[PDB]
């Protein structure tokens, strides 16, 4: 209900800290292009259903907008605008030549079918075809979207434009112009941030104790990366509980027994709950799981020197304040989870060139980009006695404000 207001508040605070006037905030608080469309879709039963779609473009001064499309019944204009602004912030943090964009459709994919989903995706692409393209707006997947939906959208756009346009949409399969590293991008970015934070704090990664809350794809890849780097993972968690071993957890065996959903717990063995998993003795803590897990009660009980928010908003304002008081280095999600956006940008670059890179090239480029962003944010937060979250917000808004001023919009 207040997501847009909160985003506006953080934008205002960042602009005030940077010293920009109020006209910049007036321009950047709301997107300058919001489109609402009605999509008629023929269903399997033969009836026709009218779906509602939204597409918001926060800014285009830096470059073409970059956004995602989510198929949820609770989508709203306010949510779409707020997430477009957040995407702009992420792009500015990573220093991409992108703006912020966000798409949404009011639907229930659980009740929808394969052919109905294809028809809905095509209809949405048609409705927004007038303001999107490889040079205007680049969509990607979000909740209840995947490579098949991206491929359907790409086919729709090519069928409209009379020529193939792989760069119009990212998140595609490899055969259609996808990029390697699309699955381990977030985990690799989190690993890079963890390594940089450890270097800054003097903690040696060799033998460092890491706890990961969440063993999905991101959690599994992150645990594998720490194990390869030499850090010891002393705790993991899944939907059924967690495990604890100060001397190591045998990540190889855990991954071998890992199923599709990421379950690794045994049946007749007691498990460790997340509440006391977060309180374990470790140097690095990584919540990549459900949000609102760190609060006042557990902030003092947390024993981690570094906390990295792999998931979205796993920490509250009070928890951040307490961690800052306790001198615990917090890595915000807006920075940690930018690996997916970076890999989508690499896919866009590959589509533009016609040349597709390899896993090693993607790895090294992502490493350099994330390291530069992390170092810039850390230097900003050291020069100004503020938090990394505020520093990241300022870095995100600076590029957009400067581009708008240069182009003369304000």
């Amino acid at each position: 209900l207040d997501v847009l207001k909160s985003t506006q508040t953080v934008i205002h605070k960042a602009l005030e800290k940077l010293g920009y006037p109020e006209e910049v905030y007036e321009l950047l608080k709301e997107p300058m292009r919001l489109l609402t469309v009605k999509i008629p879709v023929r269903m399997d039963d033969g009836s026709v259903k009218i779906f509602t779609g939204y597409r918001a473009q926060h800014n285009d001064s830096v470059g073409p907008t970059k956004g995602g499309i989510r198929f949820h019944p609770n989508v709203t204009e306010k949510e779409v605008k707020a997430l477009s602004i957040w995407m702009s912030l992420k792009c500015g943090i990573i220093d991409l030549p992108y703006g912020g964009g966000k798409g949404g459709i009011v639907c229930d994919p659980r009740d929808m079918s394969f052919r109905e989903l294809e028809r809905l995706s095509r209809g949405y692409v048609r409705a927004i075809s007038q303001i999107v393209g490889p040079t205007k707006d680049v969509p990607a997947p979000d909740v209840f979207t995947n490579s098949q939906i991206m491929a359907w959208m790409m086919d729709e756009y090519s069928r409209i434009d009379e020529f193939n346009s792989p760069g119009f949409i990212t998140g595609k399969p490899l055969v259609l112009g996808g990029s390697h590293g699309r699955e381990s991008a977030t985990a690799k970015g989190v690993t890079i941030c963890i390594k940089e934070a450890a270097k800054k704090r003097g903690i040696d990664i060799k033998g460092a104790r890491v706890v990961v809350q969440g063993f999905g794809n991101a959690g599994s890849y992150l645990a594998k990366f720490m194990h390869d780097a030499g850090a010891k993972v002393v705790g993991i968690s899944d939907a059924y509980g967690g495990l604890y071993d100060p001397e190591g957890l045998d990540i190889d065996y855990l991954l071998d027994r890992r199923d599709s959903f990421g379950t690794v717990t045994k049946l007749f063995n007691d498990t460790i709950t997340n509440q006391e998993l977060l309180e374990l003795d470790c140097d690095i803590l990584v919540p990549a799981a459900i949000e609102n897990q760190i609060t006042e009660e557990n902030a003092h009980n947390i024993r981690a020197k570094i906390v990295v928010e792999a998931a979205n908003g796993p920490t509250t304002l009070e928890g951040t304040k307490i961690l800052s008081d306790r001198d615990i280095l917090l890595v915000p999600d807006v920075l940690a989870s930018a690996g997916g956006v970076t890999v989508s940008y690499f896919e866009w670059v590959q589509n533009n060139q016609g040349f597709y890179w390899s896993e090693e090239e993607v790895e090294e480029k992502l490493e350099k980009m994330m390291v530069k962003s992390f170092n810039n944010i850390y230097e900003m937060a050291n020069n100004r006695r503020i938090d990394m979250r505020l520093a990241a917000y300022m870095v995100g808004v600076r590029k957009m404000a400067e581009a708008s001023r240069f182009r003369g919009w304000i």
């Binding site: 994919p109 959903f261 949000e291």
Partner: protein, 1483 residues
């Protein structure tokens, strides 16, 4: 019974190998049982190589080409000749069409006069046909494929034409001679074997048991390729999966021959035959025999950390295309040039082999099978679980299992394929939506939820992490008999493993189980590559809402999903057919997931019963060859119980989503209760449900959900056979029952009332495990309880009559209540019938453990039974020796019947001898396939002393009898018990189920004096509610089946039949007698007489009447008296007398078996669903004897103890003087000492005799159960080796086993002892000079042993004593260790710890001087009695040996001992110190 093989490694062919093979068969014949007559061949067979020289010599007309270019057939034909020549002509035509040449035919000479009457009558005509290979076939594999195709075509043509001919063997390298012949009769029947021209590099042999007395020549094996010893419990699922995959099979090797060989498996064949057919088909498909064996019976990879990465990848890959063939199996296969032997995953069968210096291998179940030279023996080993014994004749060497497995695993990149092709379903984290409906109450009412159901099944599951317990098993009527509408789930009852296969302990053997499930479409099984593992895999079939949504929204074109709403309005058949059409359309479109949903249902549309829908869809897809291309997800509100989930999985469901249960949990959380969060509640519910399903599988012994899914381990009660065949094919329904219209009517009724329900916003209270006014009827209602108590306390008769009337009439509770007497006879007077004093002698009080009950109730029941002349049963908790002496007042507390369970807690020589009947509890009604668990807080000192355990230490009773892995093992145990007490009756207690009649026939063959049938309504002190309610069948069906089968097989006169389970009235007793029961059991009613009010709180140790609790405060409230039990029994007997007088029967034997007196009552016909039952199955009287007459002559005479030991030991025992003697022993001498031990115990008792008084030396190989129940004073020496069950139930004494003096190889490397040793042992010591097998010291309770290595599952359920292992240890060591101490010597402490189970043990080092001295003395005695080089070296290097030793001790055991020692030091007496420590540790 058993298997064997005598072979030469290098391939040298002789006739002595065949002669030795028949000798092994003759030796193994003793294992099998005795049928109607001994001369009839129970079943035997011999497989050998092709005898080219003999064929050339004996043909003289057929031009036989060189070895591998011609094949030999072997056919059993009917005596009729016209059809014989018809089939011969057809076979020749098929051969000519295939292009191979018909060399000719031959007739095998047969000596019919040497065979028994039945086998003489059934003897077929034996004719062989010779096939010559065409020049085109360069390789022998193509020729073998052509012969296989010819044989399959001939068999298909024969079954189509209805002709009865069998192809015993048709190969270019193997020939089989088999039939209903004894080992001695085989050679006589086949005069060819006598000829010296018979030469073969190997000879495999098998002898059967034939549970039934009507075997067939075809069913005998060796089969075409392999011999199988044991049973298969996943046969239905294996058959269904194979027949589904056969349609999709595509092979280049066979080309278009797949259409000819489409059936693959024979529907009417046995488990072994079906397994052999699958093996041979896969071998010809292009798979090596070892690879095929590994794929069919894979090792346990899930939950097993002792397996290498390559092997784990291989087995995980092959689990995606072939389900395991679970069960106890020992398999020995051969292809002419290669021979292989393997065991099941759990290794539940014995297999020992010798390798000699002359390149000869002798492998068999037993070890003392043939005479061998010790100086010639090289290796004495055994077939370890997960290890393949492979021999290649051409290469002339034994190929190591490690080498074979490594090559097979590394031949492909299985690990890389699994890593790459796996698909992830990582759900979005911000898509969370806690689902609620706002019509939750309406849906709950529609699906049958109740306040009791919630508060007593869902909340306890979250709280405790396990299925809630219960007591006083189901007294309510069946679903078919209940007036109230019932779910289709309640019509299906879980089955269990009683005999021919044991159950397993999933918790203790988790390394063997696997819940892994595959979702998607299977790849090309014959030619698999990558795509076979491009599917989804789950660790738990139960799906949360988020997982379900992710699966639905995968969208992946290769992984597509379609949703089908399983709803109907009027035509259930129509609804099912639309579901079928939708499934076929989705499959054609490419969908790989089918989601059957009950959602979107309203008053007009009611949901199809999910069990019926899943079963129908599964059968349809299996028939159409499309099941393997899809997986089934269920989204139903009628899924909240372990029984529901298990039924859905077993009838086809791949995954389930209990959305309504999740919604109920969410509502409870929201309204304040159940503070735990929604996510943790969902996860806990899923884990608990999966654990319950695993327990349900363990009941039948199935260790893998993959196999359980195909297998149908449920039996319907009240479902029409037509409906069963249409949708539940393979399921058993003895009485048929309701139809699809009735099922739809019930569902519609429940839905309609739930959706209308316009008065109340509350759920009606349940009546499943409690009695509520206006609820479901309960047999032990308050009215009946109080009437019975008042009648027994008055000694009044009209009150008892009122109670009997209420129990019998006014409701339909049991099947027997549907029967009415004819009423047209000649009534007599009450004075012309036998007296109640004689009648009561057939009654019993039923087994009830001392721990479960109180001392007062147990002694009261025993006193009442002894006074009345009946028999009382002591449970599995042992007995107090002081009760064996009658009190001065004349009351006797002794229990006539002594029970033998898997725990073997109080089992001892004294305990066994001080009895008249020894019962073997194969299963009980409430918890048939389960074991038990007694927590330390419940293990009071007055119970621990009786059970020979430490107070405050938990006790675990394993589900299976580790001795009883099959009917032969049951016979062996019966023989051991008879040796222990020759003056006692051996009883076997089973639970009613399908096939129980055949099992009873097998038991009678195994020579059990008494057979007891228990209904599923029987009581218990503690058991899961799902097991109580949904497991077992009424005793009526089982009793009728057992009676009919025994009379048909001519074994009824040899055994006494008993029944129990809700026998509350003389009418019930009369009905049981008419059904064919001579004895009757009563357990619950005596408790109610004593004061039980059916509180169903026995498991809580809070009985308000002091009946089922050990609390002294509650025991002080006990008011029961034996006089009340006496009055109850006398009233029952008077009722039986009155009924007999009315029916015109003078004696119990006269009335027994007279089912003609019964007819269906008008009430059953009036009933709207009980009128569709066919009770003619129970109303059937075959001609024969209907009462026990033959005393079941045992083989006590001719035994070694009677012939040699006793005549030279009786005087010594009587005089109390020393006596040393020596004998030569062979495998036929099984027990060898139990009779002498029993005599010693009878003469003296527990004190026995002074140590080393009687000394018995034995030279050679001993049989099963050597040194069993040997008390103090006896010392057995064994120069040689021994078989399984060494030291079983040891009650003292010494057992020493030393390797033969002529065997110079390392004893610590060579095997000397069988698998199970010292099972249930209580006291004594032993010294073993060599490695032992699996399950060493399973239930030891004080015996101290020294052994040079052991197998897997060592020290499983030990509660006392010590074990010293001077060698390696198998995996899962100390699995269930609650007491005792194990000392293991090893170099790799890390490896030893990894092998051991870490759940409930600690690792320490030898620091105590007293312990070190005790171990040193034990080793000194061992080396003195054995001359052990390892022991001598350790004693020499004692300083380093102590350092390198490892100690294992349970935490609770250590703590309790420390507390007791501290109190003793403080200066407290033993009783008070023990009590204080127990209270402190169990506060």
């Amino acid at each position: 019974c058993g298997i064997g093989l005598y072979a030469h490694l290098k391939g040298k062919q002789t006739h002595d190998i065949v002669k030795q093979g028949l000798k092994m068969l003759c030796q193994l014949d003793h294992r099998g049982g005795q049928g109607s007559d001994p001369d009839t061949g129970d079943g035997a067979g011999l497989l050998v190589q092709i005898p080219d020289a003999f064929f050339r010599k004996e043909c003289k007309n057929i031009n036989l080409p060189e070895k591998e270019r011609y094949g030999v057939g072997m056919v059993f034909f009917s005596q009729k000749e016209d059809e014989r020549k018809k089939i011969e002509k057809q076979i020749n035509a098929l051969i000519e069409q295939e292009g191979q040449v018909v060399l000719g035919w031959r007739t095998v000479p047969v000596n019919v006069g040497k065979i028994g009457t039945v086998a003489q009558k059934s003897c077929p005509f034996v004719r062989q046909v010779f096939i010559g290979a065409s020049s085109d076939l360069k390789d022998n594999l193509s020729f073998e494929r052509k012969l296989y195709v010819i044989r399959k075509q001939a068999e298909n043509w024969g079954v189509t034409e209805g002709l009865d001919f069998y192809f015993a063997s048709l190969s270019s390298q193997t020939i089989v001679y088999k039939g209903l012949l004894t080992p001695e009769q085989v050679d006589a029947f086949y005069s060819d074997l006598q000829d010296e021209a018979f030469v073969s590099a190997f000879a495999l042999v098998h002898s059967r048991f034939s549970t039934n007395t009507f075997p067939t020549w075809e069913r005998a094996h060796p089969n075409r390729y392999l011999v199988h010893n044991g049973e298969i419990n996943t046969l239905r699922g294996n058959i269904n999966w194979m027949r589904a995959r056969e349609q999709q099979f595509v092979s280049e090797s066979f080309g278009e021959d797949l259409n000819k060989i489409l059936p693959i498996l024979n529907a009417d064949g046995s488990d072994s035959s079906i397994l052999d057919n699958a093996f041979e088909f896969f071998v010809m498909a292009g798979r090596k025999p070892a690879h095929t064996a590994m794929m069919l019976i894979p090792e346990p990879w899930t939950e097993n950390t002792h397996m290498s990465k390559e092997k784990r990848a291989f087995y995980e890959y092959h689990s995606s295309l072939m389900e395991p063939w679970d069960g106890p199996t020992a398999i020995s296969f051969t292809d002419g040039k290669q021979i292989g032997a393997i065991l099941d995953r759990n290794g539940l069968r014995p297999a020992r082999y010798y390798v000699t210096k002359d390149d000869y291998i002798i492998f068999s179940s037993e070890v003392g099978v043939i005479e061998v030279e010790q100086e010639n023996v090289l290796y004495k080993n055994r077939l370890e679980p997960g290890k393949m014994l492979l021999i290649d004749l051409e290469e002339g060497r034994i190929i190591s299992d490690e080498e074979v497995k490594t090559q097979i695993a590394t031949e492909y990149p299985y690990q890389k394929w699994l890593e790459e092709e796996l698909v992830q379903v990582n759900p979005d984290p911000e898509s969370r939506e806690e689902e609620q409906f706002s019509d939750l109450l309406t849906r709950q009412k529609a699906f049958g939820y109740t306040y009791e159901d919630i508060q007593k099944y869902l909340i306890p599951v979250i709280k405790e992490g396990k299925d809630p317990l219960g007591s006083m098993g189901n007294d309510a009527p069946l679903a078919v008999l209940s007036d109230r509408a019932q779910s289709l789930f309640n019509y299906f009852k879980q089955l269990f493993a009683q005999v021919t296969n044991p159950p397993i302990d999933a918790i203790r053997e988790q390394l063997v189980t696997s819940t892994m499930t595959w979702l998607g479409a299977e790849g090309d099984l014959l030619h698999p590559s990558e795509r076979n593992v491009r599917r989804i895999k789950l660790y738990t079939p139960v799906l949360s809402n988020e997982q379900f949504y992710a699966l639905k929204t995968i969208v992946h074109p290769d992984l597509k999903s379609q949703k089908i709403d399983v709803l109907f309005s009027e035509d259930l058949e129509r609804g099912l057919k639309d579901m079928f059409t939708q499934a076929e359309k989705a499959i054609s479109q490419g969908v790989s997931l089918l989601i059957l949903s009950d959602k979107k249902m309203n008053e007009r549309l009611t949901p199809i019963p999910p069990l019926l829908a899943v079963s129908a869809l599964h059968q349809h897809l299996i028939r159409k060859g499309l099941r393997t291309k899809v997986s089934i997800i269920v989204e139903s509100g009628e899924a909240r119980e372990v029984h529901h989930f298990a039924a859905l999985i077993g009838y086809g469901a791949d995954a389930i989503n209990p959305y309504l249960a999740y919604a109920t949990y969410k509502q409870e959380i929201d309204e304040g209760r159940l503070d735990i969060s929604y996510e943790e509640a969902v996860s806990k519910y899923g884990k608990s449900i999966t654990e319950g399903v695993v327990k349900v599988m363990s009941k039948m012994g199935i260790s893998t959900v993959q196999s359980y899914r195909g297998a149908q381990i449920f039996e319907a009660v009240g479902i029409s056979r037509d409906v069963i065949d249409r949708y539940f094919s393979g399921t058993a329904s003895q009485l048929g029952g309701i139809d699809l219209q009735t099922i739809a009517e019930e569902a519609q009724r429940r839905h309609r009332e739930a959706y209308q329900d316009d008065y109340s916003k509350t759920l009606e209270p349940g009546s499943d495990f409690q009695w509520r006014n206006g609820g479901e009827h309960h047999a032990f209602n308050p009215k009946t309880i109080h009437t019975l108590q008042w009648a027994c306390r008055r000694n009044d008769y009209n009150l008892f009559k009122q109670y009997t009337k209420a129990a019998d009439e006014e409701r339909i509770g049991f099947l027997r209540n549907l029967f009415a007497f004819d009423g047209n006879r000649k009534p007599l007077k009450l004075e012309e019938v036998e007296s109640a004093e004689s009648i009561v002698k057939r009654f019993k009080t039923g087994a009830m453990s001392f721990g479960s009950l109180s001392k007062e109730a147990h002694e009261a029941l025993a006193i009442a039974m002894n006074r009345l002349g009946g028999k009382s049963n002591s449970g599995e908790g042992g007995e107090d020796p002081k009760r064996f002496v009658p009190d001065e007042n004349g009351d006797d507390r002794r229990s006539a019947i002594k029970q033998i369970a898997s725990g073997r807690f109080g089992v001892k020589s004294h305990y066994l001898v001080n009895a008249d009947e020894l019962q073997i509890k194969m299963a009980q009604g409430a918890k048939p396939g389960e074991g038990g668990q007694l927590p330390g807080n419940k293990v009071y000192p007055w119970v621990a002393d009786v059970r020979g355990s430490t107070p405050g230490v938990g006790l675990i009773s394993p589900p299976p009898h580790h001795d009883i892995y099959s009917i032969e093992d049951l016979a062996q145990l019966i023989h051991d018990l008879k040796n222990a007490n020759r003056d006692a009756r051996i009883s076997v207690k089973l639970v009613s189920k399908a096939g129980v009649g055949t099992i009873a026939a097998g038991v009678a063959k195994a020579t059990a004096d008494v057979i007891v049938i228990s209904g599923y309504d029987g009581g218990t002190g503690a058991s899961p509610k799902t097991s109580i309610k949904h497991t077992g069948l009424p005793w009526e069906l089982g009793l009728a089946e057992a009676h009919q089968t025994l009379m048909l097989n001519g074994l009824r006169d040899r055994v006494v039949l008993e029944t129990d389970g809700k026998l509350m009235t003389g009418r019930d007793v009369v009905m049981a007698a008419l059904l064919g029961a001579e004895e009757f059991g009563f357990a619950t009613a005596p408790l109610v007489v004593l004061g039980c009010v059916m509180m169903r709180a026995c498991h809580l140790d809070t009985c308000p009447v002091g009946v089922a609790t050990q609390n002294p405060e509650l025991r002080k409230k006990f008011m029961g008296d034996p006089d009340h039990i006496v009055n109850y029994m006398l009233f029952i007997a008077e009722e039986v007398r009155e009924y007999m007088a009315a029916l015109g029967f003078k004696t119990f034997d006269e009335m027994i078996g007279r089912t003609d007196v019964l007819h269906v009552s008008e009430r059953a016909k009036e009933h709207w669903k009980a009128s569709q039952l066919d009770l003619s199955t129970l109303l059937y009287q075959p001609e024969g004897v209907r009462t026990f007459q033959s005393p079941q002559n045992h083989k006590i005479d001719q035994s070694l103890d009677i012939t040699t030991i006793l005549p030279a030991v009786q005087e010594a025992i009587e005089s109390g003087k020393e006596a040393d003697i020596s004998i030569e022993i062979n495998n036929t001498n099984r027990v060898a000492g139990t009779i002498t031990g029993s005599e010693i115990s009878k003469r003296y008792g527990e004190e026995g005799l002074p140590e080393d008084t009687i000394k018995l030396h034995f030279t050679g190989s001993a049989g099963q159960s050597f040194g069993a129940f040997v008390p103090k004073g006896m010392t057995l020496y064994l120069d040689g080796d021994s078989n399984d069950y060494v030291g079983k139930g040891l009650s003292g004494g010494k057992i020493i086993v030393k390797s033969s003096e002529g065997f110079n190889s390392a004893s610590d490397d060579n095997v000397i002892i069988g698998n199970v040793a010292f099972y249930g042992a209580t006291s004594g010591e032993a010294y073993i000079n060599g490695r032992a097998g699996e399950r060493f010291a399973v239930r030891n309770s004080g015996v101290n042993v020294v052994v040079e290595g052991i197998g897997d599952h060592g020290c499983e359920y030990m509660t006392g004593g010590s074990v010293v292992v001077l060698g390696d240890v198998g995996k899962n060591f100390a699995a269930g260790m609650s007491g005792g101490i194990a000392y293991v010597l090893t170099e790799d402490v890390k490896a030893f710890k990894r092998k051991c189970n870490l759940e409930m043990i600690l690792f320490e080092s030898l620091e105590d001087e007293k312990e070190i001295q005790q171990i040193k003395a034990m080793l000194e005695r061992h080396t003195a009695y054995t001359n052990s080089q390892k022991a001598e070296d350790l004693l020499d290097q004692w300083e380093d040996s102590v350092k390198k030793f490892v100690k294992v001790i349970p935490k609770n055991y250590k703590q309790m001992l420390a507390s007791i020692e501290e109190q003793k030091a403080a200066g407290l007496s033993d009783e008070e110190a023990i009590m204080f420590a127990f209270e402190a540790n169990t506060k």
